[PDB]
Amino acid sequence: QDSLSFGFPTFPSDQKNLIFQGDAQIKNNAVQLTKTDSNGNPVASTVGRILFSAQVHLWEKSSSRVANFQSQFSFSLKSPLSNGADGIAFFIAPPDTTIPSGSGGGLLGLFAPGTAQNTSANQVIAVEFDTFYAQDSNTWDPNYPHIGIDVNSIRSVKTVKWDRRDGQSLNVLVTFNPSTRNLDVVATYSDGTRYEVSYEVDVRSVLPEWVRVGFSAASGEQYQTHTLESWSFTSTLLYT
Amino acid sequence: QDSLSFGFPTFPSDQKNLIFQGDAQIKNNAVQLTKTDSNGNPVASTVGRILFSAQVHLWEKSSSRVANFQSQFSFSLKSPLSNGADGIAFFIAPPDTTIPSGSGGGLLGLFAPGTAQNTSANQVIAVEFDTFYAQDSNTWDPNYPHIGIDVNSIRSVKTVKWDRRDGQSLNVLVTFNPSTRNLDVVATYSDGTRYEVSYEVDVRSVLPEWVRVGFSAASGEQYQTHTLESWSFTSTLLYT
C-alpha cells in the first residue's frame, strides 16, 4: 500500500499486529519495553522491542517516490535509581530486524557491539532518548541526557540536551518530509518544555524500500522502565 | 490499534502485506483474483482471494466499541463469453480464514458446499457482485445479475439488480456505521449509473473481535477475469 496508518491511543493486552521481541510485553494498557518484576519495578539486564507487523513502503525505486511519514508517541521512564538507564528509541529498520546479540545496555537493543559505530554495517534510523551517558561505558555519548538521531550508528549524527523527568510522559512527534529530506523531532513535556532536533537524511540510501517501524529500549547495570503509552503512525508515498 | 487504514491506488508486483490464496496474483499493477492464461484470457475452474496481513479490530468487548469502516475499491470483469462467471466479493472473516474445499464456482471461494446456506456454520460478511445465476447450479440466487450482501450464507440476505459491463471498472464504496449498524454499498460505473443496497447487521454477533478483510473471486465452468484495480480501507473503533 502507498499509504498506511494506525493509531494506538492505548495498548490493550489483546494485541494482534505487534511483533514483540525480547522482554517487551503489554502491561496496564501500555507497552513495557523492558522487563519489570511482579511489583512493576524495573530490573537490570533487559532488552525489548516491538514492531508493527505490517511493512511500511518507505520508498519506491521504480516510481522514484519516497514516503512522507509521521510518528506521534508518548512514553515515560521511571526508576528508583538516580541514574536510570539506558533509554528508549523509535526506529526504522529492515522487515527481518531482530535484537542483535549483545545489543543490551547502552546499545539500546539496536546495534551489535562489534559494529555499533560502523555505519556501513547497519541499516537503521532511530530517534533515541538516551538517559545514560557514563563516559567510561557509553564513550560515544555527549556527557548528559539527550535526544539523538541515529543513522547506522549508536553514535548519534546529532544530539540535543534533554531532561529526564521520572514518571512524566514525554510526547514526541517524529516527521520526515521527502521534499526537504528533513527528519524532524519535537518532544514536549506536559508543562510546555520543548525539545527540537532536525537532520537532513536521504532514507533511500540508508534503508530498503520496505521497512518495519517500532520501538526499542534496554537496561544494563542501571535500569528504569521504558513505558510506551501511545503511538500513531502514518506514511504515504509522494513524488520527489 | 484502534484505527487502521491502508490504500492501494494500484497494485505493484512487489507486495509485502497481502496474503494471496488460491490463484490470486499481481499482473499489470492489478490483482488478478482468478487465473488467466499466457495471453491474459480467463480460464475455467479457478478460485483466488487476497487478504490484508494486518488484522482489523472490528469490535472490542471490553470498551463496548464497534468499528466504523469504509472500503473503497474498483474492479473490472472481462470475458470472451458474455455469460462470465462467477463474480467477485469483498469479505470480512476470521483472521485464519482459508479457501474452503469445493468453494469454487457459484460459491465464490467463500463457502463450503455442505454448509453454504447454514448461517450458524459460517463466520463471514461479504459484498458480492454475482454475474452467474443459473438456477440449476446457483439455486440460491435471484434470476438476474446482482450485488448482494452475504451474512454467513451464499444466499444473500439482501440483493439489488446489477448490470455486468464487460471491461468497465465498477467503483465501490462499502461502509459500516456502528451507530445505526447499517452496512451500505454504493457502486457506480464511470457514467454515473448507480446501484445501492444496504442492510442492518450487528457485526458483533457475526464476527470475532479481530478479523481480516480481503476479496474473493471464482469461475466454475463459465469464466471471466476478476480484476481488482484499487483498494483503500479504513476502520476506527467508536463508542455509540
Ligand SMILES: CO[C@H]1O[C@H](CO)[C@@H](O)[C@H](O)[C@@H]1O[C@H]1O[C@H](CO)[C@@H](O)[C@H](O)[C@@H]1O
Ligand atoms: C556499566 O555498563 C553497563 O550498564 C550501562 C548502564 O545500564 C550500559 O550503558 C552499558 O552498555 C553496560 O551494559 C552492558 O553490560 C551489562 C552487564 O554485563 C549488560 O547487562 C548489558 O546488556 C550491556 O551489555
Ligand SMILES: CO[C@H]1O[C@H](CO)[C@@H](O)[C@H](O)[C@@H]1O[C@H]1O[C@H](CO)[C@@H](O)[C@H](O)[C@@H]1O
Ligand atoms: C455447473 O456450473 C458450474 O459452473 C457455474 C458457472 O461457472 C458455477 O456457478 C457452478 O458453481 C458450477 O461450478 C462448479 O463446478 C465446476 C466444475 O465441476 C468447478 O470448477 C467449480 O469449482 C464449481 O464447483
Ligand SMILES: [Ca+2]
Ligand atoms: Ca547512552
Ligand SMILES: [Ca+2]
Ligand atoms: Ca451466483
Ligand SMILES: [Mn+2]
Ligand atoms: Mn546516545
Ligand SMILES: [Mn+2]
Ligand atoms: Mn448471488
